[PDB]
């Protein structure tokens, strides 16, 4: 993702370009410690566990759905919004 400048034999400011690439990587990467803010759509292939306080926006919009018949109340007909379990 990050834009690093290529390190080649014979290049002019080798030490300085290596320093800038190391500094770029150090400030753009998500690290295993400290509080941070991460931008972009993050898709996780494997399992994810949150030991701390998990915060998610709009949980009831996202995970619950209520469908009922107004005019009759005997036959509810609906198009499922996502893969679910009905009660």
């Amino acid at each position: 993702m990050a834009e690093l400048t290529k390190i080649t034999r014979g290049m002019q400011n080798g030490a300085e370009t290596i320093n800038d690439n190391l500094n770029k990587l150090n400030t753009i990467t998500v690290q295993k410690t400290g509080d941070e803010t991460i931008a972009g759509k993050k898709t996780f292939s494997g399992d994810v566990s949150v030991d701390g306080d998990f915060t998610m926006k709009k949980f009831a919009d996202s995970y619950v759905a209520f469908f009922a018949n107004k005019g009759s109340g005997n036959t509810v007909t609906f198009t499922a919004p996502w893969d679910c379990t009905a009660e």
Binding site: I7, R9, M11, Q12, E16
Partner: protein, 129 residues
Amino acid sequence: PSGFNVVIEHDSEYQPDVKVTYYKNSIGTEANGFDTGPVFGGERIYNLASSLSYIRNKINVELPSVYAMAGEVVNNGNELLLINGTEIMRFVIEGATITKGYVEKVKPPTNLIVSDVTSTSAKISWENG
């Protein structure tokens, strides 16, 4: 004269130690550009024997005359670098910050002799450094 003298100006009110090393073709000093030298990272590092003397805020690093070299002076605060092409002479200070560093060009006078001394006068004579 006495030798090759490098002056290191610092912020301590005391006598900081200085350690001198010499090395060729460290990163950024190779003639044909980055990593074009014979030993990537730098050739043999030699410890240079120095004789140090101090005045407030100024260390004078006296090295044998044989090491005398020209070159750009780089001040990195923790260390001073005397860069001459491919060659580097590195000076590492301990317990202070390098303010300014340079090869001593204006050198102090030497053979001070007091002659023609009377009750009211004397003649002071010397020799250029």
